[PDB]
PDB file of C-alpha atoms (C1' of nucleotides) in Angstrom:
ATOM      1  CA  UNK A1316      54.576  45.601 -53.821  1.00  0.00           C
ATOM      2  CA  UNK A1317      58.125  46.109 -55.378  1.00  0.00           C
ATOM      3  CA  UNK A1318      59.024  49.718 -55.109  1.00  0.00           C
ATOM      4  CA  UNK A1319      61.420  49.849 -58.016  1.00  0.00           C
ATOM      5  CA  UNK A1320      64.771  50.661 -57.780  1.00  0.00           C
ATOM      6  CA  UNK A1321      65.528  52.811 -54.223  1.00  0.00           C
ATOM      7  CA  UNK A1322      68.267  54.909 -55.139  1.00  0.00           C
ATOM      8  CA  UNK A1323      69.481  57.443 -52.740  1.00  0.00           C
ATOM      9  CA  UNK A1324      71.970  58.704 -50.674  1.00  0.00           C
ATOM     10  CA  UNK A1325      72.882  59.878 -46.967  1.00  0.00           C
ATOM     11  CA  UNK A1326      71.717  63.093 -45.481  1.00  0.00           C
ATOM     12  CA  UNK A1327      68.201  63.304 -45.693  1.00  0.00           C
ATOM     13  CA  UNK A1328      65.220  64.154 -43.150  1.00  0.00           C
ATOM     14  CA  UNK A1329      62.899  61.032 -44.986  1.00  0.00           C
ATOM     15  CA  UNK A1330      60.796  63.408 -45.989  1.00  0.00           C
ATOM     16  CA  UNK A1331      61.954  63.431 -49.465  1.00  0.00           C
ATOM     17  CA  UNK A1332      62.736  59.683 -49.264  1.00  0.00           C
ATOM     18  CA  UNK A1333      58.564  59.188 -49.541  1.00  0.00           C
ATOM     19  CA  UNK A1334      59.148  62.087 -52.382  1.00  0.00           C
ATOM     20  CA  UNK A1335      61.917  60.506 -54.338  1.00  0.00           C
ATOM     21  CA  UNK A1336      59.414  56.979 -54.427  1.00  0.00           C
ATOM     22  CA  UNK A1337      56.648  59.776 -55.520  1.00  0.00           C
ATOM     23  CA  UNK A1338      58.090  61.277 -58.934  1.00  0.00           C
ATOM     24  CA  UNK A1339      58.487  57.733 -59.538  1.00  0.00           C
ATOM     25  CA  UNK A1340      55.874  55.903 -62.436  1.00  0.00           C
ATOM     26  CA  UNK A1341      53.698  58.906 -62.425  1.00  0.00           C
ATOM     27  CA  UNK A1342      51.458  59.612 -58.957  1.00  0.00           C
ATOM     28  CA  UNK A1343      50.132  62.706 -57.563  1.00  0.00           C
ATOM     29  CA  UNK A1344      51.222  63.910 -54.091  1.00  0.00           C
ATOM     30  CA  UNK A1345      51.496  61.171 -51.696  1.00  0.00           C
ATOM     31  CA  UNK A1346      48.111  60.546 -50.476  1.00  0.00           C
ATOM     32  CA  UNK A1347      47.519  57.666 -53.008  1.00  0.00           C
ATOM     33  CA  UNK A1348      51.240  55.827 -51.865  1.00  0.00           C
ATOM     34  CA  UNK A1349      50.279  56.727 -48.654  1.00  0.00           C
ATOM     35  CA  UNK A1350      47.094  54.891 -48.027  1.00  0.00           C
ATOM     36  CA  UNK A1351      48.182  51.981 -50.423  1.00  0.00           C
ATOM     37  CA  UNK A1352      51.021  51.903 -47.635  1.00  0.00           C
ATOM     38  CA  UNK A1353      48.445  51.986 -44.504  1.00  0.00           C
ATOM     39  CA  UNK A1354      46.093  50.128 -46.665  1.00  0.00           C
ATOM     40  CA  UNK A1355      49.044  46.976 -46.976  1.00  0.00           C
ATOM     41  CA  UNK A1356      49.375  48.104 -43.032  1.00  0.00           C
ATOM     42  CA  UNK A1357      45.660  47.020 -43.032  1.00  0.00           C
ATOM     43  CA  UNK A1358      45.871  44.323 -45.005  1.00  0.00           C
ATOM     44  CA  UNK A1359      48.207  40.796 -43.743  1.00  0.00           C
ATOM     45  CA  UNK A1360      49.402  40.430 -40.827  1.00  0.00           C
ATOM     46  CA  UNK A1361      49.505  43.586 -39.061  1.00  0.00           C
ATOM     47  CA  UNK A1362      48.318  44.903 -35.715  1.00  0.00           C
ATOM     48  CA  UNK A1363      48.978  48.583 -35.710  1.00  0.00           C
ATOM     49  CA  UNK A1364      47.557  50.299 -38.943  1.00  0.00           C
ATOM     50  CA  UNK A1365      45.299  52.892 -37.375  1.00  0.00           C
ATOM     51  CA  UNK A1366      47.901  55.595 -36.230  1.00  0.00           C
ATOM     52  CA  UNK A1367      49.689  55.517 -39.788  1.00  0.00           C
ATOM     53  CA  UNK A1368      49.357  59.387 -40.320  1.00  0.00           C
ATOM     54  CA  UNK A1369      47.480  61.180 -43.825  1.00  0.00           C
ATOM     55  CA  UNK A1370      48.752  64.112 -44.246  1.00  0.00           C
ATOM     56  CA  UNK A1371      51.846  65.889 -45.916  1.00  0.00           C
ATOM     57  CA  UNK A1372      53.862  66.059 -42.440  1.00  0.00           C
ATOM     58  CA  UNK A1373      53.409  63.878 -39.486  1.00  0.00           C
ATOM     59  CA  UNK A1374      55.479  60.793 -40.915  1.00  0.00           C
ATOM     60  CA  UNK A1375      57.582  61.988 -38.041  1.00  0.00           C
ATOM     61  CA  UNK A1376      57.973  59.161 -35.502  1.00  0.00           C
ATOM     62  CA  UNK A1377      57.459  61.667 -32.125  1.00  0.00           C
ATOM     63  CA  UNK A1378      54.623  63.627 -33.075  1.00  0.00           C
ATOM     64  CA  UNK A1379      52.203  61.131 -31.702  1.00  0.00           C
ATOM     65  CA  UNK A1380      52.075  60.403 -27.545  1.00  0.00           C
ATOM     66  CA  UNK A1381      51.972  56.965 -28.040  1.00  0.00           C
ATOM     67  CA  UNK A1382      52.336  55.798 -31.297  1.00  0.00           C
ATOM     68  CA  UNK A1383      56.075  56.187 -31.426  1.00  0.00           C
ATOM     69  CA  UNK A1384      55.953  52.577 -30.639  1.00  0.00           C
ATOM     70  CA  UNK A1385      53.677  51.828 -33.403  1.00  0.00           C
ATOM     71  CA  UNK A1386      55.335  54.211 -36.195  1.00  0.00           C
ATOM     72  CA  UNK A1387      58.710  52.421 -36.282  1.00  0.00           C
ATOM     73  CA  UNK A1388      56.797  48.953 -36.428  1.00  0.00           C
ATOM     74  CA  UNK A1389      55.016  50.454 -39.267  1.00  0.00           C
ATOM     75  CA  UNK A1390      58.407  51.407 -40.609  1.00  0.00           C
ATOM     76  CA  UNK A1391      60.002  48.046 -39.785  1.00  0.00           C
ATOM     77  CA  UNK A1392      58.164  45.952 -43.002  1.00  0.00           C
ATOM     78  CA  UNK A1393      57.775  48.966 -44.900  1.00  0.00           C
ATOM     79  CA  UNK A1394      61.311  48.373 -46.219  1.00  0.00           C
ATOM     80  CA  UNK A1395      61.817  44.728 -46.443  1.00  0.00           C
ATOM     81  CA  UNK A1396      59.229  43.099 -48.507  1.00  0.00           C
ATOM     82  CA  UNK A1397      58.031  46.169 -50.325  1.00  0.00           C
ATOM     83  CA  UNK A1398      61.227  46.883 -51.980  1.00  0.00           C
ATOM     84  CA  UNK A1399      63.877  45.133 -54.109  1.00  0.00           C
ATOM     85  CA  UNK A1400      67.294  45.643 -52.464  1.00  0.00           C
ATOM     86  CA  UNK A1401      65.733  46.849 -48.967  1.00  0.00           C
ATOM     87  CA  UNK A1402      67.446  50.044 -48.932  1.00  0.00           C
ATOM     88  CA  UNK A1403      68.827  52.068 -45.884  1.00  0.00           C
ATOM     89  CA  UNK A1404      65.475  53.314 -44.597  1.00  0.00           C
ATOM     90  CA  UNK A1405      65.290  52.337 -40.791  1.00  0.00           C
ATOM     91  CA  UNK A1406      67.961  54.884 -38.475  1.00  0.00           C
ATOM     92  CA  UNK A1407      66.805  57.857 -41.007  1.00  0.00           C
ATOM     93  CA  UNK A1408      63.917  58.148 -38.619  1.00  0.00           C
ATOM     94  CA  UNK A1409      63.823  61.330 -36.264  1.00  0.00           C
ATOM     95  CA  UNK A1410      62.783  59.303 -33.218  1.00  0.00           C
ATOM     96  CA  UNK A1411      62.732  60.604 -29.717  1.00  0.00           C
ATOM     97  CA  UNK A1412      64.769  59.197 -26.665  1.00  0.00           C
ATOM     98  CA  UNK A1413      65.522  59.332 -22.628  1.00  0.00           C
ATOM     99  CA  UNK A1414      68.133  61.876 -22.758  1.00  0.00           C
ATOM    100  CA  UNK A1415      68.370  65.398 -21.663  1.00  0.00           C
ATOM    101  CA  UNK A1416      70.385  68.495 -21.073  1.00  0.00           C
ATOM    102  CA  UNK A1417      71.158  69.864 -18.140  1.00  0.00           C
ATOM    103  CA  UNK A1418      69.114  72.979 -18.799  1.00  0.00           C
ATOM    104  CA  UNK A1419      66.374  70.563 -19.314  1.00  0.00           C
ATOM    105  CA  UNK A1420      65.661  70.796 -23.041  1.00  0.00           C
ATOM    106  CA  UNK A1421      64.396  67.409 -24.393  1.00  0.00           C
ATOM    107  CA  UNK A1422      66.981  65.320 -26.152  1.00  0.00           C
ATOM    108  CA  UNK A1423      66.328  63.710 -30.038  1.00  0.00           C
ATOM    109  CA  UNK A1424      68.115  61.561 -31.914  1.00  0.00           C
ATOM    110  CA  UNK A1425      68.466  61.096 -35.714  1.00  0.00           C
ATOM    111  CA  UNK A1426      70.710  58.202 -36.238  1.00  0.00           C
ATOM    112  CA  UNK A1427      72.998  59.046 -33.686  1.00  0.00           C
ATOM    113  CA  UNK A1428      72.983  62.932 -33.187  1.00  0.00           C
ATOM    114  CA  UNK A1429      71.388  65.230 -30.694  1.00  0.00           C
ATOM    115  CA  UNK A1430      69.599  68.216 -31.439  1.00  0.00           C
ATOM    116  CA  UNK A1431      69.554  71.140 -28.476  1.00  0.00           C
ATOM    117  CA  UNK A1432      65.598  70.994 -28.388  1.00  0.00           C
ATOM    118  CA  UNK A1433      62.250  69.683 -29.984  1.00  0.00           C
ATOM    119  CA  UNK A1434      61.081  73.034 -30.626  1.00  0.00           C
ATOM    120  CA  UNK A1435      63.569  74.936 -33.267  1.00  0.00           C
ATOM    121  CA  UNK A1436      61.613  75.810 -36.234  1.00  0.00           C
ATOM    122  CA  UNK A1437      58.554  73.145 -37.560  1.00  0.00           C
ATOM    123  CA  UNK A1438      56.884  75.286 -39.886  1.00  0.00           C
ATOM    124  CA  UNK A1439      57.777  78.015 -42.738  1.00  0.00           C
ATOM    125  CA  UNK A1440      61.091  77.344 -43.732  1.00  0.00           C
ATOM    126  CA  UNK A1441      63.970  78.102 -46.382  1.00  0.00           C
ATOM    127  CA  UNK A1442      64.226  75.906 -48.847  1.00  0.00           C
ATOM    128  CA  UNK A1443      66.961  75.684 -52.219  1.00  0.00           C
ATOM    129  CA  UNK A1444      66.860  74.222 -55.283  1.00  0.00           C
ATOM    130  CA  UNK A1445      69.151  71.510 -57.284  1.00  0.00           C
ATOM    131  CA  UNK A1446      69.560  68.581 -54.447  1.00  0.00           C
ATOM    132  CA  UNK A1447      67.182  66.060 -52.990  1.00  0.00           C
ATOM    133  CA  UNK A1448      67.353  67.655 -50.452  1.00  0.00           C
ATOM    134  CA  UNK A1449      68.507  67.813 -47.544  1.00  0.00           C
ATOM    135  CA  UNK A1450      69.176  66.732 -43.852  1.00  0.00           C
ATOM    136  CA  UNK A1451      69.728  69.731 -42.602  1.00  0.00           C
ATOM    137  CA  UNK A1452      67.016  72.162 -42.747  1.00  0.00           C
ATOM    138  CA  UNK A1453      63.875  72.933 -40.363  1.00  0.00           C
ATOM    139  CA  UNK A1454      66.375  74.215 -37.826  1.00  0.00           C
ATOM    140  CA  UNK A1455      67.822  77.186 -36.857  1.00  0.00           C
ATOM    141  CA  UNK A1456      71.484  77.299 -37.762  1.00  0.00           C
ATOM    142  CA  UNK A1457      71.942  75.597 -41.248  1.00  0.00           C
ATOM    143  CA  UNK A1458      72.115  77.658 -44.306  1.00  0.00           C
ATOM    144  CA  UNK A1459      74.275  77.357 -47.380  1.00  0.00           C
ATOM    145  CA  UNK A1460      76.425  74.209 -47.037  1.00  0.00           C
ATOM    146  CA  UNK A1461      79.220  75.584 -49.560  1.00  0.00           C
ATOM    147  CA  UNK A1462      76.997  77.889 -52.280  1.00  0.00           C
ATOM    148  CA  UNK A1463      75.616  80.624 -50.807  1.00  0.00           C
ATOM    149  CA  UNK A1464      72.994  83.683 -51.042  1.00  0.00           C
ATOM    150  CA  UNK A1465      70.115  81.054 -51.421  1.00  0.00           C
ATOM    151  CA  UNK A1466      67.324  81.805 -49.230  1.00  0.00           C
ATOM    152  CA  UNK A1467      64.598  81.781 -51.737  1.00  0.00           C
ATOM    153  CA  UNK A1468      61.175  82.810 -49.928  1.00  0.00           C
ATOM    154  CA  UNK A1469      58.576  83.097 -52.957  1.00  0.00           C
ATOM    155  CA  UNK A1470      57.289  86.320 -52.864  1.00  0.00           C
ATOM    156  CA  UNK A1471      57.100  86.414 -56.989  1.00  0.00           C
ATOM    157  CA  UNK A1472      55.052  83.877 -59.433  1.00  0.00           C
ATOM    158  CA  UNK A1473      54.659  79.989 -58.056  1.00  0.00           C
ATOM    159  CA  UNK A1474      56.787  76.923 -59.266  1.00  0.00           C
ATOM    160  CA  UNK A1475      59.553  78.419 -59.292  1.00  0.00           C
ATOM    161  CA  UNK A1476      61.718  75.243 -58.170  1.00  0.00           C
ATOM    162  CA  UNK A1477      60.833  72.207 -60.350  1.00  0.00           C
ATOM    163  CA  UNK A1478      60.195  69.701 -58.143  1.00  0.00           C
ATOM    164  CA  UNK A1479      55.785  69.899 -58.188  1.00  0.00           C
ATOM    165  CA  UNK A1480      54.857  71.027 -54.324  1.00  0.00           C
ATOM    166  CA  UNK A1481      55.606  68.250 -52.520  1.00  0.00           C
ATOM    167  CA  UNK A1482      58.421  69.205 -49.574  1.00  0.00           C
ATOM    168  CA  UNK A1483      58.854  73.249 -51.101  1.00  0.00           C
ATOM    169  CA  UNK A1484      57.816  74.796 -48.367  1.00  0.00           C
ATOM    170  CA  UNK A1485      57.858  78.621 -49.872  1.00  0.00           C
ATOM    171  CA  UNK A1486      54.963  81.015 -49.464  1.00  0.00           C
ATOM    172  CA  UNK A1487      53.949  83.965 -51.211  1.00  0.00           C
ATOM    173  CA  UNK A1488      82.566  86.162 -42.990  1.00  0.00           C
ATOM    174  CA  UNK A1489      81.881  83.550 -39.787  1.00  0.00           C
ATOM    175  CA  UNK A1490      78.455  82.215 -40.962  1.00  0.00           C
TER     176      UNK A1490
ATOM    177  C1'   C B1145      37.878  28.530  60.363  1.00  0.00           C
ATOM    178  C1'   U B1146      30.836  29.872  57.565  1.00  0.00           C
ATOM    179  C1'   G B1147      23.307  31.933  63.215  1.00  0.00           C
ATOM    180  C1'   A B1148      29.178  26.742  63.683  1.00  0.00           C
ATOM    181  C1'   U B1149      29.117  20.746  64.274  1.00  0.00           C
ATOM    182  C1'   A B1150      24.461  16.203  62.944  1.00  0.00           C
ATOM    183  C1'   A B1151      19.315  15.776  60.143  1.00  0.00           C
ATOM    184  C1'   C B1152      14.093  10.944  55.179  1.00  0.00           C
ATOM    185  C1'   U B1153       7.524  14.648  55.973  1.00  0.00           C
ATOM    186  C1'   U B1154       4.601  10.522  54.522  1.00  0.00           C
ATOM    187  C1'   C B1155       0.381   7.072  53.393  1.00  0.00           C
ATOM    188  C1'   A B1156      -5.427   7.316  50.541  1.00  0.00           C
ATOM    189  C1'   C B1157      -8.935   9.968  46.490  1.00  0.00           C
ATOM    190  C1'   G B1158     -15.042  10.185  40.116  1.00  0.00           C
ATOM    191  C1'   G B1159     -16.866  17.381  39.439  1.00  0.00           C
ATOM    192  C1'   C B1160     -21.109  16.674  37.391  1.00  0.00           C
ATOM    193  C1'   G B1161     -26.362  17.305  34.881  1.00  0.00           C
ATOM    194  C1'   G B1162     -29.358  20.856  30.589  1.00  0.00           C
ATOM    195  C1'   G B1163     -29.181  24.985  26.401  1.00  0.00           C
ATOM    196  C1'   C B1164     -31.421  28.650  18.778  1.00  0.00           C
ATOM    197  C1'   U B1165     -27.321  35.261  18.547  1.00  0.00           C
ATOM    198  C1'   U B1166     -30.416  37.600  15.629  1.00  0.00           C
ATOM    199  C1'   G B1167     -32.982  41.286  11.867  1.00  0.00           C
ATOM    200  C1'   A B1168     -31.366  45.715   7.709  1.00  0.00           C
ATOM    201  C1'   U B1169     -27.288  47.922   4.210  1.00  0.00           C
ATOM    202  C1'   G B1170     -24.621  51.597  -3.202  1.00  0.00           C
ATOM    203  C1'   U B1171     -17.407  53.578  -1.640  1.00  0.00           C
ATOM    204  C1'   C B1172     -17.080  56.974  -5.121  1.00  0.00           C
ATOM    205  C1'   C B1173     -15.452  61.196  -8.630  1.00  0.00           C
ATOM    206  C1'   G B1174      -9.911  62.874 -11.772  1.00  0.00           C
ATOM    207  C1'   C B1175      -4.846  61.306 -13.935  1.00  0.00           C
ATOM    208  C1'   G B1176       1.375  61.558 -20.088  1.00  0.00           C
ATOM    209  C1'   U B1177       6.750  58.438 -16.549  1.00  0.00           C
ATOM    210  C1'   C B1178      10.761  59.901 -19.788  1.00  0.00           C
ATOM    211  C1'   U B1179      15.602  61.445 -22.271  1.00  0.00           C
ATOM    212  C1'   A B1180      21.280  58.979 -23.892  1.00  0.00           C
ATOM    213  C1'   C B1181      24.344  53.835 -24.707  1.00  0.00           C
ATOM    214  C1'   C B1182      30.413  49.366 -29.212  1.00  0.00           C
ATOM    215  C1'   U B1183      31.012  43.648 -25.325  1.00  0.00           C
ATOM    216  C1'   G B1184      36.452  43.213 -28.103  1.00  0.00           C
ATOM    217  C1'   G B1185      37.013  35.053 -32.295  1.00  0.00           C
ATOM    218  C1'   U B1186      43.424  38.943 -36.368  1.00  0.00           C
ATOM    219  C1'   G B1187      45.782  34.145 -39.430  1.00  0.00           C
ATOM    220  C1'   A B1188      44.053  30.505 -36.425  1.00  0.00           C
ATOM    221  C1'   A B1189      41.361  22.659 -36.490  1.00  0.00           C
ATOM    222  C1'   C B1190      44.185  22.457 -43.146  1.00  0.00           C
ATOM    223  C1'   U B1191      43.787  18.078 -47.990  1.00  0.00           C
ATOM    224  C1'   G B1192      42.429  13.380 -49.606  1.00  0.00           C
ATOM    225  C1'   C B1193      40.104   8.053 -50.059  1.00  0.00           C
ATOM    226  C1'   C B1194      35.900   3.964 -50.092  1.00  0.00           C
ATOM    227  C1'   G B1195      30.565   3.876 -50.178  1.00  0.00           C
ATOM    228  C1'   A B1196      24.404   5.387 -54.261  1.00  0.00           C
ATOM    229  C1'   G B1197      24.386   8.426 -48.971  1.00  0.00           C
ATOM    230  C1'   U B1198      23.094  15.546 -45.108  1.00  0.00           C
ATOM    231  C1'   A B1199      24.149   7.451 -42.791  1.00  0.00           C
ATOM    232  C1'   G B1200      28.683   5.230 -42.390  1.00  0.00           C
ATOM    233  C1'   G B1201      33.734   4.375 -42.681  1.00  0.00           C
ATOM    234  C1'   U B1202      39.205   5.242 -43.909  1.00  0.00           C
ATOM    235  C1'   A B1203      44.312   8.509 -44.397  1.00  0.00           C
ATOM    236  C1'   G B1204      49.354  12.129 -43.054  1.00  0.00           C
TER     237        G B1204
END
RNA sequence: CUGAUAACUUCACGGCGGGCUUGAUGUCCGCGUCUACCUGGUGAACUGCCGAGUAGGUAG
């Protein structure tokens, strides 16, 4: 009960959203926030707790066969009577839909934009510093968005970014 | 359009007498049934009042 204060902004993946309500009043990760939130999906008046994911991904309403259904139910009273000023949290969700090319590549939509397919990148990467964070990333054409040269794969020493390994995903002119 | 045409078989009645199936008998020996199993009432018919009362009544 009463998420204080949701601040942000546009142009975000919700991954950080669950972030930005993490480096708030001092919790680790967001496997504690995480079950409290499947745990108040357990508790009144609920019928669909069980597919509520655990892990650090996965909060992702298509990577499921069948609880798509379920995961924006979940996310339907996970804004309104858990937060003061219920903040713009549903239509951030990276749903799936019914649409399709013509080369028949699967169609997704964000809030109202189409990606070319549900494959591009998933998994390891580039990541920068000094927003939070972005919309734009785990794709394959989106780099710099105005500053530029900022790749930033961590081969040297770890924590290098200061935001405590929760999306920082780093291991160790047309453009 | 028939081996064609027509056609009363009827009346009467005592089966009876007698009678010992018997004697004897050993069905026995042996025996591993077992392994694995979800029945599924969400919150839902709630709170008083009189009477000594696990009886009885009485409210919205």
């Amino acid at each position: 009960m009463f998420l204080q204060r949701p601040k942000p902004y546009s142009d975000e993946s919700l991954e950080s959203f669950f972030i930005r309500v993490a480096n708030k009043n001092g919790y680790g990760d967001v496997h504690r926030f995480l079950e409290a939130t499947k745990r108040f999906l357990q508790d009144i008046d609920h019928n669909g707790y069980q597919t509520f994911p655990t892990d650090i991904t996965r909060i992702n309403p298509y990577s499921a066969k069948n609880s798509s259904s379920a995961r924006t139910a979940s996310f339907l009273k996970l804004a309104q009577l858990t937060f003061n000023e219920p903040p713009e949290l549903l239509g951030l969700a990276i749903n799936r839909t019914n649409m399709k090319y013509s080369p028949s590549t699967s169609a997704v939509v964000r809030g109202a934009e189409v990606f070319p397919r549900s494959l591009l990148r998933t998994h390891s990467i580039p990541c920068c510093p000094l927003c939070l964070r972005e919309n734009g990333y785990a794709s394959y054409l989106w780099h710099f968005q105005g500053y530029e040269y900022c790749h930033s794969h961590n081969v040297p020493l770890i924590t290098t970014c200061s935001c405590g390994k929760e999306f920082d995903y780093r291991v160790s002119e047309a453009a």
